[PDB]
Ligand binder design. Structure first.
Ligand SMILES: [Br-]
Ligand SMILES: [Br-]
Ligand SMILES: [Br-]
Ligand SMILES: [Br-]
Ligand SMILES: [Br-]
Ligand SMILES: [Br-]
Ligand SMILES: [Br-]
Ligand SMILES: [Br-]
Lengths: 48, 207
């Protein structure tokens, strides 16, 4: 049930070539970044 | 006095709510604009879900523009290690239209929570449990003309929104990032999922 992010989220939210996506949990989307290998954190900003 | 609205995650009264599991968030308080409370569950064992809007009752976990109220005092919870520990989990019972948020630890100061993992709820229940972790606030400086904050605004009622904010970067000194989607420096984005969910982008503005 995962969704593609809106344009500006897609463009700016996830760092270090991570992938933006949304999960609908309770009527609001929850955005998340699927990190490329070697990264961690909310926007995949940190190196592991 | 401000119109602090009391809403219910299901139904419209205390009686309609489930009983809280241990360590479940019992109310969510939204402090983005005019404060409002969304009731999640009824505390067991004679306790009552705290309803004050601040953190000084000792039953509150703050994250971004929200406060999460717990049936028992929060000092009993351990402090999360950044990245590795799950501060809380979310599950939904689709047939009951009920969400449960179980808190395991408190994020350190200057942290933000984020969705990190999922696992099946278990053998007998349907669906996934979503696991949230804690990350330190970004020291990132904004690139020129890039947004500094994103807003997702769900119109729950004509004069009540449920809003999620995502900070992206720190503005240069002498500049401010808009903190509300109606401030100067904000551009409307797109509808997302539903007609009543609208995104906005905020940009660094001089002053
Ligand atoms: Br989010
Ligand atoms: Br309890
Ligand atoms: Br209660
Ligand atoms: Br209060
Ligand atoms: Br308080
Ligand atoms: Br993690
Ligand atoms: Br303004
Ligand atoms: Br605009």
């Amino acid at each position: 049930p995962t969704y593609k992010c809106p344009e500006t989220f897609d463009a700016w939210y996830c760092l270090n070539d991570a992938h933006c996506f949304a999960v609908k949990i309770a009527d609001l989307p929850v955005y998340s970044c699927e990190c490329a290998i070697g990264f961690m954190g909310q926007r995949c900003e940190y190196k592991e | 006095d401000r119109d602090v609205r009391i809403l219910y995650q299901v139904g419209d009264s205390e009686e309609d709510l489930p009983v809280c599991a241990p360590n479940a968030v019992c109310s969510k308080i939204d402090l983005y604009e005019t404060p409002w409370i969304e009731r999640q569950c009824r505390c067991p064992d004679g306790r009552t879900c705290p309803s004050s809007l601040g953190v000084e009752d000792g039953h509150t976990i703050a994250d971004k523009t929200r406060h999460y109220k717990m049936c028992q005092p929060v000092h009993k919870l351990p402090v999360c290690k950044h990245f590795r520990d799950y501060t809380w989990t979310l599950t939904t019972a689709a047939e009951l239209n009920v969400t449960e948020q179980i808190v395991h630890c408190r994020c350190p100061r200057n942290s933000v929570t984020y969705l990190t993992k999922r696992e099946p709820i278990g053998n007998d229940s349907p669906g996934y449990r979503y696991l949230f972790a804690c990350s330190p606030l970004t020291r990132l400086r904004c690139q020129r003309k890039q947004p500094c904050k994103l807003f997702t605004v769900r119109k729950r009622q004509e004069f009540l929104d449920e809003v999620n904010i995502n900070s992206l970067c720190q503005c240069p000194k002498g500049h401010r990032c808009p903190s509300h989607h109606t401030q100067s420096g904000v551009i409307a984005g797109e509808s997302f999922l539903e007609d009543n969910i609208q995104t906005y982008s905020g940009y660094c503005m001089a002053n």
